[PDB]
Design a protein around this ligand. Structure first.
Ligand code: ADP
Ligand code: MG
Lengths: 55, 371, 66, 55
C-alpha cells in the first residue's frame, strides 16, 4: 500500500546502519588486538635482550 | 525575495521556490503539435500542447523532447517549455525572481551561453546562476565528500568530490541513460509480438519500464530461472485492454546499464566507470570515496540496483576497503532538493550573475569567475 | 552539517509511520463496514422495489388482458 | 496478512543481531586497548631497568 512501504524503508535504514556499525566495530577490534599483540611481542623481545645484557 | 530553483533535466522538468522540500510542479518536457487535420470548428484547438497537457492528448499529437542528451537541440521548444513553467505551473513573473538552472558536466559551451542569453533577454530575470547537476545531489545528501553517480534520463555522469574540492580530471560522462533503456525495452518487446512504434507509444513503454522492470542481482541465474519456471511473468494492462505478459524482458532492459554492449555501446557499465573514476583520483582519498558512493537521478530507482552495484564494486575493489552505497528514498528529486539548499544559503547570495554584469561582458560571462 | 539528518529523519521515522497507520485505521473503519452495510440496505430496498414492480405489472396485465 | 509479519520480524532480528555484535566487538576493543596501555606502561619501565643494567 502506502504507509507499509515507508515503514519497511525505515526498518531497512535501521538494518543498514546497524550492520555497518557492527562491521566497523569488528574491524576496530581486529586492529586493536593486533596492536596489543605486537606490543606484547616487542615486550618479549625486550625481556630477552635484558636477559642477554644480564648474562 | 525568493529564488526560483528550476531544473531543466531531460524527461521531467522539476521546479519550485527555494527553501522547500519538494518541487512544486513536476511535468514531462514534451511539446507536441497536432498531426491530423481537424474538422470541428471553434473547438479552441491550440497549435502546441506542452508539459502535462500533451500527456493526455497524446493520442493525436507527435510528442518530441526538446533536450536530447543534456544538450538542447531545439531552442524554440525549450523557450516554450520555460515560458509554460514560469507562467502556468508557478504563476510567478520572472521579472522579480532569481533563477538557478542546472546543467550536466562536460556540455557544449554554446548551450550554456544561449541558456543565459535567453534567461536575460526574453524572460528578463534579475540574476541567474548555472550549477553542475552532481554537486547539488551531493548537497542533498548532507555530505561534503563522496563520488556521485547521477544517472538521469538523458545522460549518466559520475563526478567525484573530496572535502568540497571537485576533481575535474576524474569526471566520467556516459551517454547511456533512461531514454536508451526505453528504446531497448521497446525493441526487445517485439520478441513476444507487441509492436510499439508511434512516438506516443514510447510513453506506454516507459510506463511499462517504470512499473515492472527490476535489476537482477545475478544475471545468469535469473536468465536460467526465467527460462524454466514461470514465477517472473508479470502482466500489465495497456491503455485499452489486451493485457501483456513480460517474461525475462523484466531484468534484461535495465541490465543494459551494466553491459552497454547490449545496445551496441562500447563503453563499460555504470559498475565499472565508477571504479575507473575512483582510480583516477589520488591514492589517499580513495577510501573515503569508496565509503561514500552516492546514487542519484531517476534511473537509479530500479528495485535492486543498490545491491547489484555494491556487489560489482566489491568484486572490483580491494578486499580491505568498505564499500557503501548511499541510496536515499528521495532519489528522484535529490538534485532539486540540493538546489533548494544551495539557493537558500547566505554565503551563496553574492555568487549570482547580476544583470549589470551580463550587460558589461555579454553572455560569455558564465564561463568567467561567476561559474 | 550532518547534524540535521537526525532532526529531519528520526522525526518522520516514527511520527510518519504512526500517523499513516492511524489514517489507514480510520479510513478502513469509516469506509468498509459502512459501505457493506449501505449496500445491503440498498439491496433490501431493491428487492422491495422488485416486489412492487411485480405486483403492479401483474395487476395491470390482469386488467388490460382483452 | 502473512508477508508483512515475517519480513518485519526478520528485519528487526537483523538489526538486533548487528547491534549486539557491535556491542561485543566494542567491549573487546576497550578491554584490548586498556591491556595495551598496561603493556606500554610496563615496557617503559622494562626499558629503564635495561638501561640501568647496561650502564
Ligand atoms: N520509479 C522508477 N523506476 C524506474 N525508472 C524510473 C522511475 N522513475 C523514473 N524513471 C526513469 O527516469 C527518468 C526520469 O529521470 P529524471 O531524474 O527525471 O531525469 P532528469 O535528470 O532529466 O530529471 C524517466 O524517463 C524514467 O525512464
Ligand atoms: Mg537530473
Amino acid at each position: 500500500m502506502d504507509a507499509i512501504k515507508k515503514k519497511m524503508q525505515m526498518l531497512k535504514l535501521d538494518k543498514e546502519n546497524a550492520l555497518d556499525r557492527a562491521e566497523q566495530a569488528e574491524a576496530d577490534k581486529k586492529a586493536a588486538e593486533d596492536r596489543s599483540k605486537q606490543l606484547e611481542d616487542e615486550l618479549v623481545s625486550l625481556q630477552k635482550k635484558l636477559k642477554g645484557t644480564e648474562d | 525575495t525568493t529564488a526560483l530553483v528550476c531544473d531543466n533535466g531531460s524527461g521531467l522538468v522539476k521546479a519550485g521556490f527555494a527553501g522547500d522540500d519538494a518541487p512544486r510542479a513536476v511535468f514531462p518536457s514534451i511539446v507536441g503539435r497536432p498531426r491530423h487535420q481537424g474538422v470541428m470548428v471553434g473547438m479552441g484547438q491550440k497549435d502546441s500542447y506542452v508539459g502535462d497537457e500533451a500527456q493526455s492528448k497524446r493520442g493525436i499529437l507527435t510528442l518530441k523532447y526538446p533536450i536530447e542528451h543534456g544538450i538542447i537541440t531545439n531552442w524554440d521548444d525549450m523557450e516554450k517549455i520555460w515560458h509554460h513553467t514560469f507562467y502556468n505551473e508557478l504563476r510567478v513573473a520572472p521579472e522579480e525572481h532569481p533563477t538557478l538552472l542546472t546543467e550536466a558536466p562536460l556540455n557544449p559551451k554554446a548551450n550554456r551561453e544561449k541558456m543565459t542569453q535567453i534567461m536575460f533577454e526574453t524572460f528578463n530575470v534579475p540574476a541567474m546562476y548555472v550549477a553542475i547537476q552532481a554537486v547539488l545531489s551531493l548537497y542533498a545528501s548532507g555530505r561534503t565528500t563522496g563520488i556521485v553517480l547521477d544517472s538521469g534520463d538523458g545522460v549518466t555522469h559520475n563526478v567525484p568530490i573530496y572535502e568540497g574540492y571537485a576533481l575535474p580530471h576524474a569526471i566520467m560522462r556516459l551517454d547511456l541513460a533512461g531514454r536508451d533503456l526505453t528504446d531497448y525495452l521497446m525493441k526487445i518487446l517485439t520478441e513476444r509480438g507487441y509492436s510499439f512504434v508511434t512516438t506516443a507509444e514510447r510513453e506506454i513503454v516507459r510506463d511499462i519500464k517504470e512499473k515492472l522492470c527490476y535489476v537482477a542481482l545475478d544475471f545468469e541465474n535469473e536468465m536460467a530461472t526465467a527460462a524454466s519456471s514461470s514465477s517472473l511473468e508479470k502482466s500489465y494492462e495497456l491503455p485499452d485492454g489486451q493485457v501483456i505478459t513480460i517474461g525475462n524482458e523484466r531484468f534484461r532492459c535495465p541490465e543494459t546499464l551494466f553491459q552497454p554492449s547490449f545496445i551496441g555501446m562500447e563503453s563499460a557499465g555504470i559498475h565499472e566507470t565508477t571504479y575507473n573514476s575512483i582510480m583516477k583520483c589520488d591514492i589517499d582519498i580513495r577510501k573515503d570515496l569508496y565509503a561514500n558512493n552516492v546514487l542519484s537521478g531517476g534511473t537509479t530507482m530500479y528495485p535492486g540496483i543498490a545491491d547489484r552495484m555494491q556487489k560489482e564494486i566489491t568484486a572490483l575493489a580491494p578486499s580491505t576497503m568498505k564499500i557503501k552505497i548511499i541510496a536515499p528514498p528521495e532519489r528522484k528529486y535529490s538534485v532539486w532538493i540540493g538546489g533548494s539548499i544551495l539557493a537558500s544559503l547566505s554565503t551563496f547570495q553574492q555568487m549570482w550573475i547580476s544583470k549589470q554584469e551580463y550587460d558589461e561582458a555579454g553572455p560569455s560571462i558564465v564561463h568567467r569567475k561567476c561559474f | 552539517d550532518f547534524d540535521d539528518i537526525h532532526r529531519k529523519r528520526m522525526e518522520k521515522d516514527l511520527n510518519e509511520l504512526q500517523a499513516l497507520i492511524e489514517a489507514h485505521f480510520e479510513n478502513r473503519k469509516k469506509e468498509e463496514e459502512e459501505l457493506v452495510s449501505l449496500k445491503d440496505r440498498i439491496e433490501r430496498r431493491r428487492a422491495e422495489r422488485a416486489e412492487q414492480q411485480r405486483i403492479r405489472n401483474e395487476r395491470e396485465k390482469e386488467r388490460q388482458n382483452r
